[PDB]
Design an enzyme around this catalytic site. Structure first.
Site, short mmCIF file in Angstrom:
data_model
loop_
_atom_site.label_atom_id
_atom_site.label_comp_id
_atom_site.label_asym_id
_atom_site.label_seq_id
_atom_site.Cartn_x
_atom_site.Cartn_y
_atom_site.Cartn_z
N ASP A 113 -4.71 0.33 9.33
CA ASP A 113 -5.96 1.18 9.15
C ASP A 113 -6.20 1.04 10.68
OD1 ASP A 113 -8.22 2.41 7.56
OD2 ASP A 113 -9.01 0.88 9.00
N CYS B 155 0.80 -1.29 0.00
CA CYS B 155 0.06 0.06 -0.17
C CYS B 155 0.80 1.31 0.00
CB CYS B 155 -0.93 0.11 1.36
SG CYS B 155 -2.33 0.91 1.21
#
Ligand SMILES: O=C(COP(=O)(O)O)[C@H](O)[C@H](O)COP(=O)(O)O
Ligand SMILES: O=C(COP(=O)(O)O)[C@H](O)[C@H](O)COP(=O)(O)O
Ligand SMILES: O=C(COP(=O)(O)O)[C@H](O)[C@H](O)COP(=O)(O)O
Ligand SMILES: O=C(COP(=O)(O)O)[C@H](O)[C@H](O)COP(=O)(O)O
Ligand SMILES: O=C(COP(=O)(O)O)[C@H](O)[C@H](O)COP(=O)(O)O
Ligand SMILES: O=C(COP(=O)(O)O)[C@H](O)[C@H](O)COP(=O)(O)O
Ligand SMILES: [Mg+2]
Ligand SMILES: [Mg+2]
Lengths: 322, 321, 320, 325, 321, 322
Positions: free
Chosen positions: E201, E132
């Protein structure tokens, strides 16, 4: 009871320990059969086979528990029985036997060189290799790779109690190979920086288990732990038709003085006892490939070598019986 | 403004007249006790300032020592609490003086307690494998033996310095059947081992164990055979940092420990003799750590750093303003 | 000690009072009446009557785990106050208050566990259970009533066949049930989404003591990566460890396995062993569902501390 | 007076095949023994006059036997054993005499080995048992019991932890039987397997069949016990004859048995239809949880099962069976 | 009953104007500071219940968010400590405005600090794999590089939205050698990876890591290859709940993200395109979590929640009753 | 050369890659040998067999890398070399080679079908299946299982860089099979709801390791982690005699532009290298069984297949060589 002299001659050097080692003892055994075939005085094939089966049994009985010896005899005798049972005549059988022995002897004298060629094929440039004990077969792979122009460094395990590591360290040094000497206890610590494990074998079981110098199992263990490709360099005649799954007992116990000197030991209580096992058993799961003179094979293919090379079969008798 | 006795002990820890996780810890705690017992402060804040100054001096002698910071943390943590809660001079001195005494008395009983705790697991007829010459580990074995449990101890040689020979004689001394073998025999004899008892130089924040080279190999094969693996170690050997995951050697010792000087001279230049002092055993290969305050899961090491030395993710140390 | 205390303490030694919750609440109640009916004129004299009342209850039946916890809950809060220089009435107030607070919480325990647990159950979940746990079942009924479509594999649970009780009880509510012999736990773990079982007690490290067979099930759930949950009240958390001495739990009457009649048709050299419980390692338990919420097994010691004030270095609250 | 006139398949074959599909004959050993014997008789009484006709008849006799029970595992193996060896002699151009001999000889050999199988398994299994061993078992396996009985008879003192083995209670049968031989027994409920695995030295159980992967199909619960044996590193052994080795794989259900084995009808009729009683006969033990399989020809690792299939029954990844065209 | 300044922030956050883990939690805190600087309460009582609604407001602006409620929990917890202590208003008005500022400050230095802590665990020669486009993760890589560390980074494409390209360009810009590969190459090159550094996250109470789809697969093969794996994440990303043993997606995203709308329109009706945003990584596949307070074991998450946000078992938000 | 022109044509098409695919290439090579055997010029044994060896050497060298090509040769030239050595005459040696080739061709034509049959026995009603790349063999298993009325659903992984998943999804959807299309990175996230894993293979090593489109090993890994039954559908002629495991060496690196479009890649910095490895190696331990036209077998049985099918051994040298 008509066994050539040369046969009983060599059977003497074998039973007395004059001739030592898997290679030599095997080649001398094959030669014994070869001379018996070349200098026989039988008038027909049937009587001749007897002499062969007799000289074979005579060599086998010198050390029935050995490993390279029985394989030498099987190699020759197996191919001899095939011919014989197949209807071959005296001069045909003699031919098969003599050419079977020579074939074996040649293959064996060039064993180490061939093992190095196959093993060097799986060694890459920049590879850090860890070994144990002092194995010519193992060492042969390293030299061959080094001499291939492949840049490699080798971590040599001390290998107590007899320090065979020193010999390997100095020897590999000579060839110009950068060596890193470390105690046995550092195997795991350094496995983190090892690319390939390469060791030798005192013998291989029917299931591909490797019987090698004490501590060998520990290294393969950590090598399995770190997914480090592990290879065992061993000649085909080192494969043994015996299994280690069921026995549970010691392979070979050695003199305690190799560990703690007689001078020093003589001064320890009766509470202390020293145990010096010569070897330990490495499971086939912790071994990726076994390098032989004929090539690379998975440990569990051990039984195929015994079958294809030596003609062995559990349901069959040794080729010189009956 | 630290008293003379604190600088005395501080110098001994620096020039190493005082060594060992135990002695270093107890001496550092004793230094703080003395600073609190002899201080001529008349104000609580002035006093606390002295304590912090004395701690910082004790801490800087051997920055990389493990038991040292924890001795200071133990005492200074309980001290910073009394202080921050508005205690008077008499009380703050009592708290410090009392906290040093408890830590020193506790450290003097540490090995003995660990011995008892470890013994609870050892059953009559157990075959125990050990490594190096850990005082804690031997304490567990000698204790079980003193409880009436017939046990056998497999002692690994422990190269390069042969500490195993010491462990063997010593154990035999008490009359404990000893089986002496080389390091390489570890896995071969694991199959006949009931328990694995080894000491520790220090424990990491994750329960990872730093100990004499080879320890992790034994623990690795012990887990392979699912053998009960206990690591005997005092609470003050636990530290906040992480030591597992990297390459960097914990401590590289002189090569002649392995190959004597008289010989290393012979060998070719292209042979390097490495002699690591320790290796790192992953928490996964240890079942419990035998502490002087009780048995614990390696993962419970962070709790000890909290309950015992007041550790917590706070950049500040009890003696750092 | 008061009169009431004694008539409840014996209703515990005589097992006249059975149940994790029932026992606890009763022990807490007894303490409530001692403070509520003590004629003590001195606070220090009052404290003695409490400790003597607590020690009496405690010794009535150690084996029970909820008992000492109910006493701890109350006595811990009692000693804290007492040490802070609380007066006779302040302490008596603190105690009565703690006893009522424990009792009320214990009364809502199964319901709340059912709720915190139901939140971790999804629609369509196949759930495997064991034995006949009121807590475990509370989680299942609660999820079912939230509209969740669940199917429960109920393990037989020999020797006493509790699975029969659980199967019938869950099915009668309308929950589809699959009943299997204990030996089939692994075979059906492959089609299991969750495992919900109870606990007789939880150790200081999160190890779970429960009806024999539980550890086996958690073992195979771990093997299959099946979310394993233990439903249990906070007063079932025990201070003892399982990493020290090997502590075998109670052995029950053999005729529970093979009836007396049948047993007298057997060779004298066959011994029937009947362990009540087995121990489940905390690494085979994902979470423990308490009436106060969900926690990972290693947080068990935090419950003993904040809840019952327990502490390694310290003494029992009613001692000294 | 037609000459060379004869019935292709001999009566004794059809008779034995009948008793096998009528269950009049049952058991891995008896069936395999009976099927091989049938082929022995076929080879012994064929009224054929040329090798080609004899072989054809032989294949017909085999096919008939194979179709008696396609769910019995030892039956086709007995057929493969004899036929594979017949095929070799036949393809190698042997004459009527030679071929009949090869066959009659293969059947005799197979039958003798089967008759000696339990005793041999008992011996190979005992090599691995030590005096003072605690052995845990499951179900009621003659093969597994032979290893235990044998070990005891060699002077090795052992204690057997017998698991109850619900739903049919085979443990009661195993406990009484072992106790009678003088073996001390601890009867336990199936659920107590992990609890007592810590004091167990060896786990010895039998097998209904072995897959090509070395997976073990045995009474429900066997996989669970093996799983916990592995977790403890207790040496685990499965005793099984070579003719229980199967060319197939096995990760619907193996075989679902009558629910009333678990909950007797009278009680079950009382239960809401909302409850389904599932009674699987077997579970599948992964080769990873078994150290060795004890065969009549010896001890082998689970993954060596494919070798037994080839060496014993000339099995090879082919499209046809030895008696198929 | 509430200040416009607070709503001002609640609006943006509710309308996705203010985005980012830090900026959202930072502004949330700043909000809880203003209502404590423009208050009109006479008694410490009418005061508290005033901000008690300030948290509720900001809380319901985006429940789904993770950092949002932590920012609140941080101040409100320390405020409830005083109010509960019945402390006077002026002493509470303070503790609150102060708590908000230190939080807001701890945040602005979060990424930088995570970088340093993480850097100490990176070493010259380290080949690092990432996934990511995590600021926290990149900060660790950048920092190590600026300490003279010779590192090389293996960037995973990170479908479906290609955050790999962003991470690749950016890292190469710092002058760091990058290797770009498709996500499927993660295991293949793990054999030559030294450290796995990724972001998060969120982090669950059990130390599980919720991150972009694919993270768990990488950690999985990292564990298979015994490659030290660290997850860079701020304390305010840790939350009270459990997310494992669940079959309901944390957040399904627009399918056209994987297959364009113009292209998807074509495909046969019996083909569904699933686009899960994240996957869950078991703590067992993570060695340590690099927070801006230091490096801790995954399972220590529950301590950070208790310490940093005052999380208790029988919990109730400090701003509710 | 003394080979027929038909053989030369077939080899030309193979060398210029006009014939693609393991099946087609293998079948084409076996048919060349058949054509060489049917139209032979020879009039004696040694002449016919000799020209059959010459032809097999040509065909062989069209593509050294190809796996099925060498196997179609070995298959035919092994049973031929055997007949030959058995003193078999000219006219009958021919018959052998023709029946071997024809048999190989037929067996191969039915290969994808049979694999579909064997694999479907292991597929159950309600099974959710995960796959990777675009394998005709794997798709054949899912297809046959659906045609047998088994209610299945296939989870199709994208398979970057070339997106072979789009083809697989569309193709399976066409047969009416419900399909869930996901990004590669989602393999673990959904392994939790997967019952069977079915993929193909470019080739199988002697250890049973599987060489397949990059990402395969990752899927098998998490499959193992979840005890999800994993099957690799693949023909016998896809089994390779050498080792590929334990080597940092790349199997085959492909055009970086397959990953990042040229227009774009050029805009990128020079300190960024884009690697596009075509395959990865799935260890045997992550694969439960291999589905072949001959049946389902365990990975490590790979060496048995090489022996019984293409007459492989260690004492081995190509049947067309000497
Ligand atoms: O274990 C040993 C022998 O130990 P010892 O010499 O003390 O008996 C060696 O590792 C192998 O035999 C080497 O094989 P080779 O030398 O044939 O390569
Ligand atoms: O590794 C060693 C000693 O290494 P060295 O002597 O080379 O420094 C010991 O295991 C620990 O120090 C614990 O011992 P103890 O229990 O006595 O503290
Ligand atoms: O093992 C048992 C009871 O066994 P027994 O009845 O044989 O004593 C239950 O699982 C626990 O007690 C928890 O259940 P609950 O949630 O109902 O308290
Ligand atoms: O599973 C059973 C019996 O099942 P069932 O009695 O329900 O058919 C046995 O373990 C095996 O068949 C092996 O036994 P043996 O060693 O006697 O062949
Ligand atoms: O997966 C993502 C964001 O995905 P998305 O942008 O698609 O929501 C990042 O790994 C985390 O947010 C952590 O990164 P950071 O350190 O920047 O918070
Ligand atoms: O990886 C691929 C093809 O990759 P590429 O086309 O990019 O070379 C397939 O999995 C195998 O070839 C097996 O497929 P099949 O069963 O159809 O032969
Ligand atoms: Mg804690
Ligand atoms: Mg084989």
């Amino acid at each position: 009871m008509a066994v050539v002299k040369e046969v009983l001659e060599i059977a003497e050097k074998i039973k007395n320990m004059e001739i030592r080692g898997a290679g030599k003892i095997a080649r001398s055994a094959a030669y014994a059969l070869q001379l018996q075939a070349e200098k026989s005085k039988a008038t027909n094939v049937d009587e001749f086979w007897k002499e062969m089966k007799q000289a074979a049994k005579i060599l086998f009985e010198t050390r029935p528990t050995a490993v390279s010896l029985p394989n030498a005899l099987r190699y020759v005798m197996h191919r001899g029985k095939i011919a014989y049972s197949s209807g071959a005549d005296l001069e045909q059988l003699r031919f098969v036997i003599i050419n079977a022995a020579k074939e074996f002897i040649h293959n064996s004298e060039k064993a180490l060189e061939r093992i190095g060629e196959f093993g060097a094929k799986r060694i890459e440039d920049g590879d850090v290799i860890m070994t144990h004990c002092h194995s010519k077969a193992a060492i042969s792979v390293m030299k061959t790779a080094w001499e291939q122009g492949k840049d490699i460094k080798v971590i040599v395990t001390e290998t107590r109690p007899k320090w065979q590591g020193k010999i390997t360290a100095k020897e590999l040094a000579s060839y110009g190979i950068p060596v890193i000497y470390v105690v046995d206890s550092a195997a795991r610590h350094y496995m983190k920086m090892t690319d390939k494990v390469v060791m030798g074998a005192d013998s291989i079981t029917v299931n591909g288990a490797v019987i090698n110098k004490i501590g060998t199992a520990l290294i393969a263990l950590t090598a399995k732990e770190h997914r480090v490709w592990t290879m065992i360099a061993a000649e085909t005649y080192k494969f043994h038709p015996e299994t280690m799954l069921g026995q549970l007992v010691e392979i070979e116990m050695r003199d305690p003085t190799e560990v703690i000197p007689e001078d020093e030991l003589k001064t320890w209580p009766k509470n202390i006892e020293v145990w010096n096992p010569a070897f330990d058993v490495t499971p086939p799961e912790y071994v990726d490939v076994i390098i032989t003179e004929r090539g690379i094979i998975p440990p569990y293919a051990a039984i195929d070598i015994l079958r294809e090379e030596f003609g062995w079969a559990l349901k069959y008798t040794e080729p010189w019986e009956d």
